[PDB]
Amino acid sequence: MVLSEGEWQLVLHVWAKVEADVAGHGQDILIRLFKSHPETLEKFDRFKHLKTEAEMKASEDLKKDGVTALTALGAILKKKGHHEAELKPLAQSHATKHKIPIKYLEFISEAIIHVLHSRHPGNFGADAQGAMNKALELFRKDIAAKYKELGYQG
Numbered sequence: 001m002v003l004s005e006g007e008w009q010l011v012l013h014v015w016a017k018v019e020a021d022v023a024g025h026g027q028d029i030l031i032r033l034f035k036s037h038p039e040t041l042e043k044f045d046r047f048k049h050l051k052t053e054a055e056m057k058a059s060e061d062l063k064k065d066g067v068t069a070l071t072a073l074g075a076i077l078k079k080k081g082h083h084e085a086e087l088k089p090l091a092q093s094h095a096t097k098h099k100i101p102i103k104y105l106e107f108i109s110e111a112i113i114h115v116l117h118s119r120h121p122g123n124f125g126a127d128a129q130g131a132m133n134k135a136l137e138l139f140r141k142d143i144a145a146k147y148k149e150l151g152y153q154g
């Protein structure tokens with residue numbers, strides 16, 4: 001699959017707004033993920049013990065991981081599909097060290113779309129959401145292919 005330049009522009013336009021507050025979006029996205037799919041929280045040994053949203057909002061460790069995740073995703077999106085080099089180390093750590101199934105990448109993709117829809121209605125209309133979904137689908141498809149090559153695929 002391949003996105004058009006127009007689709008990439010819609011993706012990068014809303015991402016530019018996300019970059020105005022990376023830490024804030026990072027918290028919102030991870031917390032959305034953990035509330036919608038509690039099982040994903042078990043993968044984060046640092047704060048698997050958090051019980052409530054209030055505790056999650058106060059966690060500096062969660063906020064830092066959110067920034068790290070979004071910054072890595074932003075770098076990938078900015079490559080507009082030419083992200084082979086960026087995906088290699090990410091695929092290896094998440095497949096071999098963290099053991100993150102593709103299902104969880106789908107879950108976080110859903111959280112990203114939910115938060116952008118909530119915080120940026122003016123720049124996340126139907127066409128923009130479709131472009132973002134297409135970009136995330138491409139990311140998941142390529143990461144899944146790498147998982148397979150690495151011996152994980154799951």
Ligand code: HEM
Nearest residue numbers: 040043044068069072073089090093094098100104105108
């Ligand atoms: C948007 C997709 C994601 C991106 C771009 C991303 C990016 C990153 C980055 C850059 C790191 C630090 C370097 C590394 O270990 O590779 C990291 C660590 C990690 N990621 Fe992801 N990640 C994503 C999704 C997920 C998901 C869905 C989970 C599991 C629910 C997850 C769990 C972890 C864990 C457990 C760590 C290690 C944290 C620690 O113990 O310090 N990641 N991720």
